[PDB]
Amino acid sequence: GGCFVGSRDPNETRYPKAPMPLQNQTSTLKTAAQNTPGAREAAALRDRVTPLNLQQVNEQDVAGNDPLGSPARVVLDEGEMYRDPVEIYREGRALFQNNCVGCHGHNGCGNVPRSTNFTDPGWQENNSDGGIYSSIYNGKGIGNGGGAMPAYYNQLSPQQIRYLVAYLRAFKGRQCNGLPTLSDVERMVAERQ
Amino acid sequence: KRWYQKLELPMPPERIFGAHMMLIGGLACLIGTYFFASMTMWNDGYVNLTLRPRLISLGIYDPYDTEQIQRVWLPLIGEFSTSKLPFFGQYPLTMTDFRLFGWGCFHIGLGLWLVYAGAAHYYGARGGATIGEIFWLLPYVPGLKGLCQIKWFTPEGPWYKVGLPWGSFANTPWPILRRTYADALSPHTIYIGLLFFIWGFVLWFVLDKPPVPLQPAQVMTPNGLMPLEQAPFPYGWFDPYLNQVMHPMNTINGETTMCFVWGVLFVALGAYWWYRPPRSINITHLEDTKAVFHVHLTAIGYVSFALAIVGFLALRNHPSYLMLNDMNVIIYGKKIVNPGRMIHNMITFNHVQVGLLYVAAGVFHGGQYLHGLNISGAYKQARSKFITWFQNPDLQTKIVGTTMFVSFVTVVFGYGMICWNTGAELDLNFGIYQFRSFRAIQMDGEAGNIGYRVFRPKNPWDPTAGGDWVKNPDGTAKLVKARNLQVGDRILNEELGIGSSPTYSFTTIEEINYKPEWGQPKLYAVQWGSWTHFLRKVNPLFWVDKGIWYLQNQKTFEATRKADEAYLAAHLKAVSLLNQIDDAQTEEAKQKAQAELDKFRPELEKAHANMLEWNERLASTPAVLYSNLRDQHRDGEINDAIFFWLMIGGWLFGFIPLLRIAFHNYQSPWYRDFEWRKQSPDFPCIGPVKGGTCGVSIQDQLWFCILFSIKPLSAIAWYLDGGWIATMMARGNEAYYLTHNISHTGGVFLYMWNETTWIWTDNHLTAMLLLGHLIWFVSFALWFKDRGSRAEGGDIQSRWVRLMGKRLGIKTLQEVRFPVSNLATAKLWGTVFFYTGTFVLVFLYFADGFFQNR
Amino acid sequence: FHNYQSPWYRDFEWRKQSPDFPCIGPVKGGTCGVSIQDQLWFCILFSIKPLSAIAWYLDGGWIATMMARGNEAYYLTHNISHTGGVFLYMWNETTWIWTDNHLTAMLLLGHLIWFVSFALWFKDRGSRAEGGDIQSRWVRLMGKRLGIKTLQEVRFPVSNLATAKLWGTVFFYTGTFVLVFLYFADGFFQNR
Amino acid sequence: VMATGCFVGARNASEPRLGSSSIAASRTAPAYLREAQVLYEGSTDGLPKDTPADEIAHYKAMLAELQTRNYAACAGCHQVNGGGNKAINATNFQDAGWQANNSSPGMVTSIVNGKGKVMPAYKDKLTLQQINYLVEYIRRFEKKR
Numbered sequence A: 001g002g003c004f005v006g007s008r009d010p011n012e013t014r015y016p017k018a019p020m021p022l023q024n025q026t027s028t029l030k031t032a033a034q035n036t037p038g039a040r041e042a043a044a045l046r047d048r049v050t051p052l053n054l055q056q057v058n059e060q061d062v063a064g065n066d067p068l069g070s071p072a073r074v075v076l077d078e079g080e081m082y083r084d085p086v087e088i089y090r091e092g093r094a095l096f097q098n099n100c101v102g103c104h105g106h107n108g109c110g111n112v113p114r115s116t117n118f119t120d121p122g123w124q125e126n127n128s129d130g131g132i133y134s135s136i137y138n139g140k141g142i143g144n145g146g147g148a149m150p151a152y153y154n155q156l157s158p159q160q161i162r163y164l165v166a167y168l169r170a171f172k173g174r175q176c177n178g179l180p181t182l183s184d185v186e187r188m189v190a191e192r193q
Numbered sequence B: 001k002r003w004y005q006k007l008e009l010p011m012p013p014e015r016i017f018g019a020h021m022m023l024i025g026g027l028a029c030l031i032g033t034y035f036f037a038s039m040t041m042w043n044d045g046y047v048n049l050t051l052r053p054r055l056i057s058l059g060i061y062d063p064y065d066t067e068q069i070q071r072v073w074l075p076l077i078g079e080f081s082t083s084k085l086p087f088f089g090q091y092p093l094t095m096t097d098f099r100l101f102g103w104g105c106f107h108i109g110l111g112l113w114l115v116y117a118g119a120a121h122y123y124g125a126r127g128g129a130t131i132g133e134i135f136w137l138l139p140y141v142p143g144l145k146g147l148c149q150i151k152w153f154t155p156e157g158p159w160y161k162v163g164l165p166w167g168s169f170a171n172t173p174w175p176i177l178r179r180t181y182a183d184a185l186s187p188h189t190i191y192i193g194l195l196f197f198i199w200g201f202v203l204w205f206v207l208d209k210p211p212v213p214l215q216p217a218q219v220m221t222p223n224g225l226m227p228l229e230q231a232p233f234p235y236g237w238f239d240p241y242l243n244q245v246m247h248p249m250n251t252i253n254g255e256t257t258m259c260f261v262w263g264v265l266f267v268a269l270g271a272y273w274w275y276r277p278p279r280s281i282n283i284t285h286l287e288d289t290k291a292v293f294h295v296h297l298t299a300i301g302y303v304s305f306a307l308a309i310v311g312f313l314a315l316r317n318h319p320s321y322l323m324l325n326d327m328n329v330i331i332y333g334k335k336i337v338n339p340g341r342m343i344h345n346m347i348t349f350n351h352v353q354v355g356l357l358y359v360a361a362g363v364f365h366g367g368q369y370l371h372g373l374n375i376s377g378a379y380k381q382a383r384s385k386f387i388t389w390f391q392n393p394d395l396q397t398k399i400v401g402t403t404m405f406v407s408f409v410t411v412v413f414g415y416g417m418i419c420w421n422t423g424a425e426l427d428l429n430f431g432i433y434q435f436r437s438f439r440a441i442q443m444d445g446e447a448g449n450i451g452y453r454v455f456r457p458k459n460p461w462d463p464t465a466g467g468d469w470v471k472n473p474d475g476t477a478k479l480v481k482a483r484n485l486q487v488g489d490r491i492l493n494e495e496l497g498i499g500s501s502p503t504y505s506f507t508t509i510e511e512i513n514y515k516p517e518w519g520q521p522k523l524y525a526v527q528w529g530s531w532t533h534f535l536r537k538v539n540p541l542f543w544v545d546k547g548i549w550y551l552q553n554q555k556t557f558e559a560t561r562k563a564d565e566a567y568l569a570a571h572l573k574a575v576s577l578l579n580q581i582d583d584a585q586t587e588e589a590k591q592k593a594q595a596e597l598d599k600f601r602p603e604l605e606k607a608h609a610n611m612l613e614w615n616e617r618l619a620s621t622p623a624v625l626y627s628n629l630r631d632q633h634r635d636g637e638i639n640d641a642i643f644f645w646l647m648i649g650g651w652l653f654g655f656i657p658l659l660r661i662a663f664h665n666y667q668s669p670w671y672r673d674f675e676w677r678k679q680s681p682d683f684p685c686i687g688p689v690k691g692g693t694c695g696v697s698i699q700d701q702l703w704f705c706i707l708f709s710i711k712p713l714s715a716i717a718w719y720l721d722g723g724w725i726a727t728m729m730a731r732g733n734e735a736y737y738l739t740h741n742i743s744h745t746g747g748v749f750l751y752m753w754n755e756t757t758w759i760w761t762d763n764h765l766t767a768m769l770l771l772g773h774l775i776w777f778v779s780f781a782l783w784f785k786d787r788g789s790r791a792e793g794g795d796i797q798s799r800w801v802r803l804m805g806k807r808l809g810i811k812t813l814q815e816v817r818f819p820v821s822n823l824a825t826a827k828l829w830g831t832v833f834f835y836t837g838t839f840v841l842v843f844l845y846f847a848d849g850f851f852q853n854r
Numbered sequence C: 001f002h003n004y005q006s007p008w009y010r011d012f013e014w015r016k017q018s019p020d021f022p023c024i025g026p027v028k029g030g031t032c033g034v035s036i037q038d039q040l041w042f043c044i045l046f047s048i049k050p051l052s053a054i055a056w057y058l059d060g061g062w063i064a065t066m067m068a069r070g071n072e073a074y075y076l077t078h079n080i081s082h083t084g085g086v087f088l089y090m091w092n093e094t095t096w097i098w099t100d101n102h103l104t105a106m107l108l109l110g111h112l113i114w115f116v117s118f119a120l121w122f123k124d125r126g127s128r129a130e131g132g133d134i135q136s137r138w139v140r141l142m143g144k145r146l147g148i149k150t151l152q153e154v155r156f157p158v159s160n161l162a163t164a165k166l167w168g169t170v171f172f173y174t175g176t177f178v179l180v181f182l183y184f185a186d187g188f189f190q191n192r
Numbered sequence D: 001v002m003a004t005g006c007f008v009g010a011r012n013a014s015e016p017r018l019g020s021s022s023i024a025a026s027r028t029a030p031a032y033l034r035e036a037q038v039l040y041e042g043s044t045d046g047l048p049k050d051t052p053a054d055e056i057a058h059y060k061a062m063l064a065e066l067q068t069r070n071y072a073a074c075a076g077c078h079q080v081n082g083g084g085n086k087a088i089n090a091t092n093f094q095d096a097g098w099q100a101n102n103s104s105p106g107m108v109t110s111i112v113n114g115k116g117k118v119m120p121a122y123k124d125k126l127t128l129q130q131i132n133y134l135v136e137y138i139r140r141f142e143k144k145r
């Protein structure tokens, strides 16, 4: 094992994103490409494909340490949350594929016993967006660190949980072959988020 | 048995020389291919990822390079028929692809040339060698026999076929040549000095990174020409992740100036040895290559260990790896979380592995030279102090026994503290003791106005105690506001919403208005329960780290302390005023109290803003030893203390068999008492006498060191990767870890499960998981006291199969005998299987990504 | 059949002299594990494998592959309910096991009993006897130096090969099967 | 010998009503669901006209005490029959997709902690044994499809 990996997909650019800010998003201290031959196509292409909030986040920025990150105080502004499907797709698929696939499957239909199944309409209709935030932040079930659905209040930021909330509504009524695509997110957002 | 014993030392100089030169050429060819696999048309994989931060720091890999090239050295460069630059003219190539291509081709050309020349020294040694013995599976091709019977590298030949015209180094009369390995120690280090100069000149003039203090005022960037101190990382010295100008010796221009510093030092130490070469009587036996092999191989192992430590600290927060986090790293279709730290962790753990393997092996090869001295009767005659200092058996038993004791005490302390705090985090009732968890409740701000029912004892200090629920004057259970909790109060677990501690009912307030030394800038009521938070201080490295750090940051530390003290006084007075309100009883007295908290609200606001901002500043000061994912101070943790005790105790556990190799290769105190003597270095036992005697030889002691060392090596892997090592069951999302601003991925066992959620997302990583687990447990078939059973049963199988062959007519089946591994070759392959099974699985822990909060 | 002579013994003229001897080797490459007592222990281990097939199957694992996910397209289209798939079952059930603190304590103790069986089952008893001997000498030196009479004749006991194989099988068995109790104790998650 | 029995402790249950074991009641489905329906509805009115005089007045005393701690009944957010209110986003317990995608253990903590914005926390209002009873009553609201 080594070297004979494939060719990289031309659509995944390596053209670099701006660095993650040193300052905390929750800071009270002071708050929260060129014309070179192909540099503009590469920047425009990075703007759709390369995720910006995938990395674990500063420790003072996690939702349990954020003053506005508790389920009671978070802002779920529907206009900001369902504003941009590129963005929901860019971010939520990277976060979901990393963190949530293990237990909920590669299709998002449930792996671990009793685990959620996000394609189910009955489950979709009976959950708020704020409800979905609560269960990510708290976990579900009794146990240390959440229950069988683990808690995320150390781990994820409020902004990271919100991309997750919007992405999860693209699962509605899909078949059990992998994850929601860019056009699933877009049909979800057109039918009012 | 002897198949891995073909080439054994001592060898003659020309044969060692020639094989090293040939291996060097071979490595240069492999690196050349790694340069080809770095080109931008390929996927990210582990091979090209482990070299990219270095090629960025060198200027050869340019992340902001987008243009495609069509003419650069000579008129034929877009794409063309039969590649134009074969197999590469299919894809768009950039300038970094061409830089990569060229350095690849350069490493393959040098490598092939070095392979040829090495062969000239190796085979011209023996007076030449024929083509069919060099290549050896070349006479099997037919109609090419004549071809393979020419002689190359002959002492006589015309210029393109010579080896060594004089036959040996010793016979050639060039009077510069040194004649003993001690005399050669001087030219070998002048030579290494020369290598350092080569590298410095290549960095200065080919790669264009001159040495400090001669760095340019200006450097070209993708956004134009900028001044060195504002140009971001690969171009200039501005670090764009940490927002600082880099120290000059933290750039590659620093590394080019050290090229000259180290090269001057090696040239001068080598010229000193030219004139006064080493001559001690304590050194003279080291001319035999069996003896030096020990010295050199164990030293090299120590060098690797030190590469790991030095490289890990120096590069943990350097912009070459953090730059990886900005590219869009995708491995087997995924997208990696913090690739920077993942590749950094891989390289340092690689080196730690190599460190162990070579210290252990070097000592084994040492024990082989000593055993041969004992066999041949010469041990007793040896003259060097480095042998005779250890010849006394009474001193050997005191050395081994006191390091066993020191190991015992440090490992009992560490493992016992792990067990204690996992008991505490799990709330386990033992009948004789109830373990209790850490829980916190915020006492200040808005949280401090949530009420609870409190069972409050009358007088803790006297037995025949009693308590009562806190009531109102009419007799109803009154709700106590978290701001008003006291030490000794009990709040029901169910009302705090806690399951998971079913054997007791209450949480107890043990400290009130607690502010973490290092953590969240909040005030808590706390249950400490059994949770030993003081154990972080039972670490010498806590105190050194925090002392240096305090001395460097002492003014903002002092202003932070004073801002905390002012906020506590202001919160305390707010709680008085809020309480007067709540206990008014007269709509007038209520209204007037409310008036005075209203006019004190501003300036509680101000004391809280002041405290928050000073705490934010203090937590942005630069790290000394213990750091953040940024490069900021963190206080030492229980994790860091346990790691500290575990390194002492666990490396002694691993290295005690090396001491036994060193002292008892021939006789140990058990042996000497029976009058026994170990006849070879690798026998498996001598049978069932005296209870059983398996595992006394030095080859077996070698295998034990390696298995035992698996344990400090896994503690290192878990620590590098973000696991909590101080308990077994710790979860990241819990109150202790969030109040103290700690990020971790696990808890010994809990890490295994939690990281595997990430492993499961990758199909290639899970196939590796399945296989590496198959390899390990098969090692048990080879290590158990079971080989007689296996041979007896393989005889039954042989017999059956030959029966079938007679009955069936199958001549090739009619004499079949299954081979069953004998005892030594079983212990060897069982150890090989046990080791490769475990460390293919540990690779997976690094390769799922790095998930500690930043 | 082979309590006294197997065909490998009978080619050599050997004759097993008792039912529980550890070996007679290093001859002929080595002979550890031919007695009847040892064949009993190898039965107990080998049988762990069909028994764990039975446990996974009772408790709802999928045994026909190693990584079946609960609701993969195949299982959903063919109305099959399972809890995991060989390895995946292991991690799937343990997330349920982690939510109980009594069962996680049992999990920790179970793991420790087992790997200690390896100390007792590896070809290593001579190493352990010769190190124990260094340990005894040392402790007696400390007794004599510090004037502590209870410690100037310490001799650490080190199991011989037969008793090491007995207690190694005991520790291996009990480790595994406390841990299996947990796969049942966690719940039956098959939803039918 | 070992488990001489097994020392697991006494079971936690709800309030005692004289002459009728509360511990026993907490494992007998028809008793526990009668108390769950009272909590759920906030009244004793929908209880079987066969209910005894002592039972009907013990429930009232339970409610009266809970009314002084500002307890809000489940019905009428969720209705007397389930499947709440789309307006308020109040969960529909009659729905099979909602029922399949919840475990009973998991459901517990969502009542204890509350759930996002509106569904209130009940950890300071009710005992964990009274939440267990309610999880059991909500199970019986399920309809097919």
Ligand code: 2GO
Residues within 6 Å of the ligand: B411, B415, B418, B646, B649, B650, B651, B653, B710, B711, B712, B714, B715, B718, B725, B748, B752, B753, B756, B772, B773, B776, B777, B837, B838, B839, B840, B841, B842, B843, B844, B845, C087, C088, C090, C091
């Ligand atoms: C957790 C999810 C998954 C499941 C399905 C799983 C199951 C199982 C089973 C089973 C039937 O359920 C088995 C039998 C099993 C077996 C193995 N696994 Zn396994 N396994 C999984 C996953 C993994 C992974 C990723 C890994 C193993 C690794 C390994 C290895 C273990 C190799 C070994 O013997 O390792 C000893 C080292 C250990 C246990 C790590 C200790 C870490 C700790 C931080 C050390 C520090 C503290 C200690 C208390 C010691 C202090 C004193 C001292 C320093 C002297 C083998 C193949 C392996 C490993 O730990 O290797 C060191 C590894 O990396 N495994 N494993």
Ligand code: 2GO
Residues within 6 Å of the ligand: B749, B750, B752, B753, C048, C049, C050, C052, C053, C056, C063, C086, C090, C091, C094, C107, C110, C111, C114, C115, C175, C176, C177, C178, C179, C180, C181, C182, C183
């Ligand atoms: C997230 C999972 C979690 C972690 C913390 C964990 C880790 C690890 C490690 C590690 C360092 O990572 C180790 C080293 C380890 C060790 C063990 N664990 Zn372990 N382990 C976990 C959990 C558990 C649990 C609950 C259990 C074990 C069980 C066991 C046992 C297993 C002992 C053993 O030898 O078991 C042999 C049987 C096996 C491996 C089961 C095979 C099942 C399969 C369905 C049978 C049929 C299919 C095959 C292809 C059959 C062959 C055909 C024929 C001959 C029948 C030991 C102590 C144990 C067990 O498997 O016993 C059969 C057990 O019950 N473990 N285990």
Ligand code: CLA
Residues within 6 Å of the ligand: B777, B778, B780, B781, B782, B784, B786, B789, B790, B791, B792, B793, B794, C033, C042, C045
């Ligand atoms: C992978 C697991 C594995 C396998 C397949 C075996 C196989 C066997 N063992 Mg070994 N053994 C194992 C692990 C295993 N063992 C472990 C963990 C220990 C320590 C407790 C032992 C200790 C041991 C003892 C003391 C003895 C054996 C014996 C046997 C043989 C039994 C006679 C027979 O009944 O044929 C039936 C054969 C089978 C049921 C096996 C079919 C084969 C397999 C599953 C295919 C193997 C796949 C392989 C891993 C993949 C690599 C191949 C690669 C090219 C793809 C059998 C060949 C006895 C023997 O007779 O020795 C010769 C014996 O006395 N075993």
Ligand code: CLA
Residues within 6 Å of the ligand: B404, B405, B407, B408, B411, B412, B415, B653, B656, B695, B704, B707, C115, C116, C118, C119, C120, C122, C124, C127, C128, C129, C130, C131, C132
């Ligand atoms: C828990 C695992 C464990 C522990 C604690 C030990 C302990 C030891 N082994 Mg054994 N061993 C083990 C597992 C273990 N081994 C395994 C899995 C194997 C298979 C490879 C072996 C194979 C083996 C060989 C071949 C040899 C030893 C030897 C040693 C001793 C080394 C001398 C010394 O370093 O003093 C230092 C002492 C320590 C470092 C350990 C302190 C006590 C520990 C930490 C905790 C006690 C834990 C125990 C589980 C507690 C239960 C207590 C009860 C009240 C609950 C030491 C007594 C050597 C020896 O000299 O023989 C006597 C030896 O030759 N080990």
Ligand SMILES: CC(C)CCCCCCCCCCCC(=O)OC[C@H](OC[C@H](C[N+](C)(C)C)C(=O)O)OC(=O)CCCCCCCCCCCC(C)C
Residues within 6 Å of the ligand: B801, B804, B805, B812, B813, B815, B816, B817, B818, B819
């Ligand atoms: C490393 C790999 C890349 C493969 C290597 C090349 C070969 C690949 C393909 C498999 C080759 C199998 C050959 C097996 C064979 O014929 O073995 C015979 C052999 O020796 C006996 C004689 C030589 N006397 C003994 C006379 C000197 C001979 O044949 O040459 O053996 C052994 O003794 C080793 C055991 C080989 C395994 C064969 C067992 C086959 C299983 C059959 C069981 C059931 C019966 C009824 C069919």
Ligand SMILES: CNCCOP(=O)(O)O[C@H](COC(=O)CCCCCCCCCCCC(C)C)OC(=O)CCCCCCCCCCCC(C)C
Residues within 6 Å of the ligand: B305, B308, B309, B312, B313, B316, B348, B352, B541, B625, B626, B627, B628, B644, B647, B648, B651, B652, B655, B716, B719, B720, B721, B722, B723, B852
């Ligand atoms: C998730 N991130 C965790 C690390 O965060 P961060 O960045 O805050 O902090 C440094 C620790 O990281 C290391 O730096 C580990 C590198 C491992 C490779 C290096 C691991 C090798 C360790 C020791 C090697 C021993 C060998 C040579 C015998 O945290 C340190 O203080 C470690 C200092 C190590 C010194 C301990 C001294 C003990 C003495 C040992 C005696 C042994 C003998 C007598 C036989």
Ligand SMILES: CNCCOP(=O)(O)O[C@H](COC(=O)CCCCCCCCCCCC(C)C)OC(=O)CCCCCCCCCCCC(C)C
Residues within 6 Å of the ligand: B691, C112, C113, C114, C116, C157, C158, C159, C160, C163
């Ligand atoms: C002449 N010499 C050789 C021939 O005779 P030979 O080998 O049979 O002598 C043995 C050997 O030595 C051991 O075998 C080592 C034990 C010490 C390791 C010490 C390490 C043990 C710790 C292991 C724990 C790990 C588990 C929990 C995972 O004969 C035995 O020990 C037979 C085993 C019987 C032991 C019975 C244990 C019951 C005691 C429980 C109550 C005691 C206290 C609670 C008061």
Ligand code: HEC
Residues within 6 Å of the ligand: A099, A100, A102, A103, A104, A112, A113, A114, A115, A116, A127, A132, A135, A136, A140, A141, A148, A149, A150, A152, A164, B757, C095, D101, D102, D103, D104, D105, D106, D107, D110
């Ligand atoms: C350890 C396994 C595991 C991981 C990791 C995990 N989950 Fe789950 N999840 C579950 C289980 C089990 C349930 C069912 C809980 C219940 O009802 O018992 C669940 C349920 C949920 C629910 C429904 C909650 C509700 O109340 O209805 C949401 C939303 C959820 N998960 C989202 C996520 C997201 C997002 C991630 C990654 C951040 C994630 N999960 C990670 C196991 C897990």
Ligand code: HEC
Residues within 6 Å of the ligand: A126, A127, A128, A129, A130, A131, A132, D040, D072, D073, D074, D075, D076, D077, D078, D088, D089, D090, D091, D102, D107, D110, D111, D115, D116, D117, D118, D119, D120, D122, D134, D138
């Ligand atoms: C004021 C309204 C209100 C009252 C009173 C109320 N609920 Fe809810 N409940 C809601 C709303 C709104 C939601 C939707 C939650 C969300 O956002 O997802 C909900 C959600 C739920 C859910 C589904 C939770 C889940 O995880 O999926 C359960 C179960 C539930 N409530 C039970 C109760 C019980 C039992 C009570 C009374 C003891 C109760 N509720 C009282 C409004 C209420």
Ligand code: SF4
Residues within 6 Å of the ligand: B684, B685, B686, B687, B688, B692, B693, B694, B695, B785, B786, B823, C022, C023, C024, C025, C026, C030, C031, C032, C033, C123, C124, C161
């Ligand atoms: S079982 Fe093997 S190692 Fe042990 S005494 Fe017998 S031949 Fe020697």
Ligand SMILES: [Ca+2]
Residues within 6 Å of the ligand: B721, B755, B845, B846, B847, B848, B849, B850, B851
């Ligand atoms: Ca990791």
Ligand SMILES: [Ca+2]
Residues within 6 Å of the ligand: C059, C093, C183, C184, C185, C186, C187, C188, C189
């Ligand atoms: Ca189960």
